[model samples]
Target: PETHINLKVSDGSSEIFFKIKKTTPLRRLMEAFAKRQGKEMDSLRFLYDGIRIQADQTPEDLDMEDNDIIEAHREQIGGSTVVTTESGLKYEDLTEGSGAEARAGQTVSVHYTGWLTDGQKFGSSKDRNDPFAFVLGGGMVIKGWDEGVQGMKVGGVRRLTIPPQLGYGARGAGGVIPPNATLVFEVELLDV
Candidate 1:
């Protein structure tokens, strides 16, 4: 049986309504939004009542009817993962860490592994056997990392998803990070 769904995605200002065919698989709808946002298809998650709805599940499976509200969210990488927000950065803490909060001018050491949204690992500090150190909010790192790493404690592990604007931008990093690529960084703050 053919069915349809209507939902809204917010831009932090107003809602963008979509009336879509149920059989289309939520993936396509989210892919459309991802394109609009210039993000990867797999990076977005669709939700209904806090539980994630996948692209493979049909509306019939969920008993979706006319004008049903489907929420769009980003997946969290770590446990207690990143909070999806308009800030263009998403992160989650996998394990609890202890220390004073990291703030501007603070020298911090972190072990990091970075990847693409498709699960491609670009680099890892573990591979290099060295932790990366940076100044908090000191313009030494990308704006996303600058903002995302704020309020973090030492010994904490976090999953950070960075959009291009907050990263290397349309030009991107040389070879490692592609142009306009949305990168994911698994950061475990070693020292603060």
Candidate 2:
């Protein structure tokens, strides 16, 4: 009965409320949301009832009711949970993922940066603007990476701390890592 509708936008953790005219294009709401959240428009996806909402679509077009819920998902390579293992492998989820989980034998693409425990930067796939692809659970990589990346989902960002045993060990690699050095890596899973 009213021209304006109240909509709820949720990002799994928090919710934001918006009031807009049903005849107004959803893009205006999207722009408002992005601006309010201090985020870029491209990094978010808005959905209603599991269907993607087009920028040109209006609430009236979808027959949305007052207080309808909209889901907002961040779409970037970007959380706050740190979990450590008994094997001395410590990891924290900087950003939670919503896509398919990485499984054994699956080729996963990722952008990552590696650093020594002393804070010396070693390498990064992001610097090249190229993502690295590898088979999860494959021994082709270091023990920590193979084990650490197993449960990750696409679009997840994780920080992994590898002990000497899980890293290059006493032999180290090239002339970069010292013997028995621990390593840290921030990895973003792009696709699986």
Candidate 3:
């Protein structure tokens, strides 16, 4: 009856497994999971059987049994996720923000001014005085935007320098970006 307790952690779309001694404190597992996901431990909320897993407790204290399941996800209080991909896209933060963080599949609003690398401004949301909204990583925009805005925090200001390949390939946009041209954008994350 003292064997390790094995549980599945799920977020509805993905899952991970964990097996730990019933005597082990839940804080250890919480920290390890947050570290594995590159998320801050306090930014996560783990639950099972409608009960939150409190720190400094063990599986036994929570009445956990072998094969019990767990649900682990962002704290839902302006949390985030780190998705890794291979691209030349670069981002530079102009200021710090402490608000809701954006993740894949979440709706986001941003204000931006797009320009050529030579400092030619062809378009801007401010000029239109209209903010834009899109789903993060939803292919509604350029590759650089879909990828670069994934980890942005609400109210954050950042600059994105995108290569032609990530912009519109070598063909480029007419009357704006040139062929094989690199692009730059000063973006501000408004909400998520």
Candidate 4:
């Protein structure tokens, strides 16, 4: 038996199309596609047929059947900068410290301020006089946040421009944030 599936991937405004034949192992399909696109398989993710599959997971684990539609994309690296809209919001490295670098699986604490392009503060741990803590690369935060916090030396200050793809996507983070909203954050590496 042969199956055919068409999958579409959209990060709010842009959409990409993928076609697969039935009986193709999802993993093979993804690898082939990624290679064709010059992307690393280990750094990509697939979501389709109502399930999100990690890059390391086999296609069978996802129960992917013939012609299964799969959406493939690279996960956003946290602390990375991306341009969104035309507000000219950009990240500038105020300082790069030479302290111990935070690694994956280590808990890190940081003071942060999030603001809109208009200089309107949306959220901040600093205002609350409390620092945020989370384990790096542990999926505690958005993809970008997790990626960005890694390798951050203690006492470093990093400015991140989080695009919708790395932040809240199209739906945003509720009414407080708008759709396709870009966020700016100043993060201070406190401790690990």
Candidate 5:
């Protein structure tokens, strides 16, 4: 079945509504918006839930529902950055650090608290006062943590929003984490 979706793009003050096909690339719609506003396409950043929207992505790819609002903000200069992965992992640095970054094969220690999508707390290393130490990329942790933890410097705190595929997936974890759960974690790097 061919489906269509209505999207609202807002700049916090004004709103623009677009009705598009579910399978159509968002690039066309984005271009239309830019042209309509007489603004440069690069001047605007389209975001859905803090994740940058890919131009090649379609409504279906993002699982966008009808009348979903996509907030459009201006591109900032030399400000904080959000790192998003193709696997639906979003890594945002809450606090910056000046130390060296944790790379592959390095022993990294971190304090973290994890919660479910519904704001339910599941686990925390900070509560135990014991930072979890693990070898990066050693397959000892979830896929999201393995990828999100890299490039983090000591003393930096990051928030990782992990999709189901990058998290516990279908198997889940300890029954506390439900099957195909999307996990959110606030991780602070203690050492690298």
Candidate 6:
């Protein structure tokens, strides 16, 4: 039997809705929705039931149930400004290294170190002495990570400051990340 899925897209303050058959790939569904809205798929971001969808994965892999909500939109960029927080943490983009040059569905390896805004180390693949590997946009990692790692070429490194919504959201991932917390990571693109 096939499942019926209802998906929704919102920009934090606004929302739109779409419905599709269960057999449809999530990426194709989003593409159709983008067409209906007169928008381009490459320019938008997607989240399912609030968790970000990896760049290369479709809704089918996530096995969306009936009445599931999906949020899709573009990233927000602003002028150069530094905002201070009560925790004395400052957020900045310090991406330095070559960017991705590969397309979706390719395998890529990387060494990485993650930390909080306060410079507190959270995790590191380097410390483990092993690099991670995954197919880009394959839903193998977090939404922000899967999406962010795309279009990166080999031998590239970038520091991403992911908001709680983009990282782990309010629930966080066990003990390493906290609720509604912002995360930072230095990602190195190896190949694929």
Candidate 3 lDDT by residue in tens digits, 1-192:
576888777643245678889889988778878887557887678888978788888988888987788888552444433333478877766544688888999999999988776556778898888999999888999999998887778878677778878898889888777888878777889989
Scored by CA lDDT, what does every candidate get?
Answer: 0.73, 0.85, 0.78, 0.66, 0.84, 0.66
How good is model 1 by TM-score? 0.58
Tens digits of per-residue lDDT for model 4, 72-162:
5443434334433243333444446578999999999998877765556688886689999999989879766776667678878777777
Order of candidate numbers by lDDT, starting with the best: 2, 5, 3, 1, 4, 6
Determine the backbone clash count of candidate 4. 7
- Show model 2 residue runs off by greater than 4 Å: 1-79
Error of 4 at 63 (Å): 69
TM-score of each: 0.58, 0.58, 0.55, 0.52, 0.58, 0.49
Q: What is the lDDT of residue 54 in candidate 3?
A: 87
User: Candidate 2 local accuracy as lDDT?
Assistant: 0.85
Model 3 regions lying over 4 Å from their true place: 1-85
lDDT of 3 at 56: 84
Residues 98-183 of candidate 1: C-alpha lDDT, one tens digit per residue: 77778888888888878777656788788879988999888998888888787778877677888899889999888888899998
lDDT of 4: 0.66
* Cα misplacement distance, residue 159 of candidate 1 (Å): 0.5
Determine the C-alpha RMSD for candidate 5 after optimal superposition of all C-alphas. Answer: 12.0
RMSD of each: 10.0, 11.8, 14.4, 14.5, 12.0, 17.2
Better of 5 and 6 by lDDT: 5
lDDT of 6 by residue, 1-192 (tens): 665667766533235566876666667767776786456877667777667676556557787766677766544333223333343333333223355486678888888888776656788887788999988788778766776666556766555667776677889888888898887776777767
Q: Kindly report which residue stretches of model 4 are placed more than 4 angstroms away from their true locations once superposed.
A: 1-91
lDDT of 2 at 98: 83
In model 1, residue pairs whose N, Cα or C atoms come closer than 3 Å (at least 3 residues apart or on different chains), thus clashing, are 81-92, 82-91, 82-92
